[PDB]
Symmetry: C4
């Protein structure tokens, strides 16, 4: 058959550069003739030959008559959709995979696994699809909005790993990982460590032995929960990132959180999903991260890197590597993903750039992509170009 995917060494390069903007609402004017779907939580996942751009639609287009409710996060209508990356996600270009108000997907080398959560808040349900077939489900364990990554899951040798979580958005949400093979859950992994609130993990392969994830703590801290999952033993441990460059939003000033690495610090309530991707070299690992320019608002997006070290213990500041989105522009969720070149993997970060005009109008998003590309420094930023009044 095709063989299973494994993480490979990253393609050569040392800086990210602006790759691609998908801005569907550049075609959504009342006087235009297009039907871009109203979405949020976009992410990209790639198989050997193509990438798919996923998002959770509100099952409504612009221009249209169903803008009310598109700023809510969960309802009976939201669906996980995709287009081939490079296509504009319209009503006719998109594929509707399953009813879901939280999602993930990934390719294992042979087929696409799609993951969607729906159901009532107190009793939601993870549903897994392998290709066309619905293959398995997993139930709410803490009865308070069972939910998942909003970014790609990760497969090695046919085994795919997925973060799920359940619990209060302003209290305890202890995550678990599911190990999924051909669409069926073959193991539950219960993490150890600093486990009181971990959600929306952005995960990737640090090597063939370790998946690492930079997650969101929506309750207690502006430091990101950082997971290290050993794939050989199927065990996970979580501790907060110690870097003084706090990656959440909102957050206090860099380096202002006093005390040991594990200290929670101030301005911990609230959060945002954060970009994280690995650059695997023969003797060095680069960890690339994105955070908003604003410490309190979803505005702007800049890139940081650090090579080697241990995220759990290094207090050192990360190295600023370029402004991807200016302060002037929306910088909402961000995520990592890798494109498969012929012999090596290309690390990328994608940025959700939400068009927010409040509850009174439509609420949707463009997706900007920056990838590791050549050398030098990052040269240009992204704007959506959308005027929400048209």
């Amino acid at each position: 058959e095709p063989e299973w995917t494994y993480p490979r060494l990253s393609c050569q390069g040392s800086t990210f550069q602006k790759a691609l903007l998908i801005s569907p609402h550049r075609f959504g004017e009342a006087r235009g003739n297009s039907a871009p779907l109203i979405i949020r939580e976009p992410f990209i996942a790639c198989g050997p030959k193509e990438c798919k751009h996923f998002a959770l639609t509100h099952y409504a287009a612009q221009p249209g008559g169903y803008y009310n409710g598109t700023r809510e996060d969960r309802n009976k209508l939201r669906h996980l959709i995709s287009v081939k990356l490079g296509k504009i996600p319209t009503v006719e270009n998109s594929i509707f995979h399953m009813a879901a108000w939280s999602g993930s997907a990934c390719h294992d080398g042979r087929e696409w696994t799609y993951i969607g959560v729906d159901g009532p808040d107190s009793n939601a349900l993870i549903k897994i699809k392998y290709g066309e077939a619905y293959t398995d489900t997993y139930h709410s364990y803490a009865n308070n909005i069972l939910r998942t990554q909003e970014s790609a899951c990760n497969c090695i040798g046919g085994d795919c790993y997925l973060m799920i979580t359940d619990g209060s958005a302003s209290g305890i949400s202890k995550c678990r990982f599911l190990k999924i093979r051909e669409g069926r859950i073959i193991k539950e992994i219960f993490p150890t460590g600093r486990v009181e609130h971990t959600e929306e993990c952005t995960c990737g392969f640090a090597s063939n032995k370790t998946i690492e994830c930079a997650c969101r703590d929506n309750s207690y801290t502006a430091k990101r929960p950082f997971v290290k999952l050993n794939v050989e033993t199927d065990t996970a441990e979580i501790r907060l990132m110690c870097t003084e460059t706090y990656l959440d939003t909102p957050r206090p000033d860099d380096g202002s959180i006093t005390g040991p690495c594990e200290s929670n610090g101030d301005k911990g309530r609230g959060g945002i999903k954060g970009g994280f991707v690995h650059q695997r070299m023969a003797s060095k690992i680069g960890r690339w991260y994105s955070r908003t320019m604003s410490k309190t608002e979803r505005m702007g997006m800049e890139l940081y890197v650090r090579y080697d070290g241990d995220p759990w213990t290094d207090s050192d500041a990360l190295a600023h590597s370029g402004v991807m989105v200016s302060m002037k522009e929306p910088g909402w969720y961000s995520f990592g993903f890798e494109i498969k070149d012929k012999k090596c993997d290309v690390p990328c970060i994608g940025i959700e750039m939400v068009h927010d005009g409040g509850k009174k109008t439509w609420h949707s998003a463009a997706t900007a992509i920056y990838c590791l590309m050549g050398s030098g420094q990052l040269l240009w930023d992204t704007v959506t170009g959308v005027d929400m009044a048209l």
Copy 2:
């Protein structure tokens, strides 16, 4: 060349869950830019890799100018169309297969067979297409709206099997089954038993030896005619389902038809096509059924199951298995179908949810899908989200 398809054991699971909603008129607003087709009698059929979503269109779109007459069932413009399941059935996404006002389709492992009926009411005509080619026809034998299933036909080792019927919607309509191989009728099967009125059969494989169908009696009863068709001898027998949980609409109260399993009972006149799909386990057979929540109107849809036994002799109540559509939402035709996973088949029930505003406006339908996945209880219902005034 490809192997012929056979029924396989069903994938593991014990409950159905909400899978997917195709709601094309969420995009039909007069201020939007899309062209969802106006349709009724949707159904889905799957081949080894892909499923198609079929329906009978009135050859008109919303927004548009041809709404008048879209609440009629037969005319010279209706056509059988399909799209790949998960796509939206618009003017450009759809393929028009043949002129037809009653239809069916199925894949035999190698090619699609498409069936459509058209012609004048008193002398209509079954037409069969195998791939791109028109291959055969079957004539009216009762000269009173020759018609067929409005759901998937069923193929085993290249032989595909199809219910047709002809006769008065208010009296006698004896059905027949056609055995079709590579688009040509190779055998006609004349059933035995209770044959006074059988139409709109929803059929599936109980095993490699038997096809069973839950059908509609539009004239005499609210119990469903239940066909057992022996594929090895090509013989069929029909008797009424004996369960007190009457599956037709309209219907009397459950358990109220006194007398032997064959008693017709009250409120027999009228009917609806009903969902039915098999869960074939190694030692046992689950028969899954759907019926409207209202006893008299096409509103709501509930799921029921019974393991093993004989539908013709068992008076036992079917086990209520969850609300798919609440009573506030339309619940019109339902149908069963199976998705082919790698090693096993996934049973699903699809629900036609008609937007009915009467004859003064457009008349069309959303399709909701529920499939067997995981364990537990069915968790969430389906709404169309459509406002017919927009």
Copy 3:
């Protein structure tokens, strides 16, 4: 490689039946959201696995602002376009093959040959394309609107044959045939016989040795020029059809043309392209033909057949085989084509049903298809369902 196509015996059957209507302008209302292309001269040609529906577009859609000039036949904008048969020919569904105001195309088993004529009236040019590549041209020989079939060319063992003509529409237009192999003209065939005016031939295979064509005489007669082209010797002879059932429009009353078979008769000025297709049986050949219901106007369409005999000498009336389009509806150009089933060929006739509101509004066409299908008699007619005011 794939092997070359040859005509095979026709699939079993004895009557035609309504197969499919493509009516693009059912979606062209000013308040709808679609873009059907404005076309005329549709025809269908099929390869082993699929059929393409071709037409000459005016490079304009409905609704739109370029309706002026769409009732003219030749200009700098007209293009040969196609869609897969079954798709609606819109701006986004269509492929634009080449600039052309007269066309033909056919598949040889390995690739599509597309043929288009354009250039000034006094000096037009046949251009041939094989797949994507432009491969050859042929020049005007009588300098007065060099033109071709408006229907499929015909390939046997890799050699494709095409009628072209040039000359006065109301005088002499002596046709020639080109023999084309992999897109290049390898022979010119100059017909013998009754050669003064032959245009718009509808041609098909009577056997592996003979192509026959029923053509239009726009100047001298209402009898159709009937070509017999011997494929083994590459010679052609033309004589008028002798049947008293005159197939052109306009025409006198059947059987009113006195004198020998070759007599021209009255009402010969004007003409229409006519449907003709072969049903090849082991010991018998059926010639199926279509003509308008009206003797003088492009209204209605009925089917006729005759088995065996010699068209050049049989004065006998053809047998009426059904009304495909009532007198009430447009019946403009018609054409034959064959769909390839697995082991046999299916003969079909397609009918151009032009929406004519005069020079003041848009002018375009729907395409109706009738194919040999089963037995009995033809049961239903086709309407476009279009209101030209919307």
Copy 4:
């Protein structure tokens, strides 16, 4: 896996003829229902089976609300897009490859290489994509709008070759050539000779040993810089074309620049990218060129040819070969490209026909194609048919 592509001898033919018009704004009327993209710098490149039609979009459609700024050349929204040749480039038909305000692409027999330039004017960046993956970048070396061909790059045995340039549009812009293999730059080529200003080179293979390019000098002359690049030694030399038929716009009268082939002459300032394609015969080489009909404005387009000789030393007038676009119609950039027939290559010239209404309205372009086919003289010209007021 597939063989690498090499140039082959051209298909037989001695004249170019009108092939195809892609005029997307024939569908852009405010009362229509389509979304043609706003674009400039179209070009076409072909692989063994298919050609793509590329362009640089302003990420806006007609009808729409983002016309302001579509007459500017560089900004943060322009993207390189393509569709399959023959399709219309709308929002939904197109694929967005990468953010870019200057581009090129070519197929090497195995995969597509896509090149785009973006970044700030003083520090822009070549980015290269091979298939789906971003693989390499090249930095600005003169810090003054690094930019590239706006037409196909050229590959031979896996090595693809690309002109880039950087420097003042009013002064010195020394070009360089990049040798790219599987998306990565493996050699930089620094030309010799007359190097003061070369940009927008249109390049093709004169043979397996030499790539030649006719380029634009925006500063000093109306004669075109002509590159001869030796693929075996990877060296290049540039000298001005000596023909009296000056191919740039603006230009003085033909033959008016007195002095040796290197004299710059008058009206050197300004320029236009010009069409150029090779016809490689067994014993001889045809060089086909296009230039505007007006000497000063981008109006009309005429075809010229010269067989053999040396472009650097030959003062001879080129042979006028027909009017492709009359003086009444726009004639802006032109480019050469080759279509792969089964055994030989078909040379073609494409013409950008811009709809220019000034900065107060939309600014976009039709693409007209002429290719070598048959013998005789070029017969018909191309009009866009677009009314910019609709």
